[PDB]
Amino acid sequence: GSSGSSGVENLKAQALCSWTAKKDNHLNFSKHDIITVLEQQENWWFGEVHGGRGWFPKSYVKIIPGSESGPSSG
């Protein structure tokens, strides 16, 4: 592609504590994992981290701004 900065990607939220899945439709993360947020119920958010998809109470996470001025994991 000749031009176009890309990168209009979905919300991410970093997990604050590890939480295994329980239901089928529950997400599984570790402490300080980064989850691709994808939808938001009342408190439970759908998001994807390490090939799952699933739902999780957002209370276990925080929204992040950008990955800004810290790493550049190329």
UniProtKB/Swiss-Prot annotation:
TM region(s), chain numbering: none
Residue ranges constituting the SH3 domain according to the UniProt record: 8-66
Tissue: Expressed in melanocytes. Ubiquitous. Isoform 1 is primarily expressed in adult heart and liver.
Top-level taxon of the source organism: Eukaryota
Location in the cell: Cytoplasm
Note in the entry: Overexpression results in the inhibition of the transferrin uptake and the blockage of the clathrin-mediated endocytosis.
Subunit structure and binding partners: Belongs to a complex that may contain multimers of ITSN1, ITSN2 and EPS15, and different partners according to the step in the endocytic process. Interacts with ADAM15. Interacts with FASLG. Interacts with ANKRD54. Interacts with FCHO2.
Protein purpose: Adapter protein that may provide indirect link between the endocytic membrane traffic and the actin assembly machinery. May regulate the formation of clathrin-coated vesicles (CCPs). Seems to be involved in CCPs maturation including invagination or budding. Involved in endocytosis of integrin beta-1 (ITGB1) and transferrin receptor (TFR). Plays a role in dendrite formation by melanocytes.
The protein's name: Intersectin-2
Organism: Homo sapiens
Residues of the full protein shown: 898 to 958 of 1697
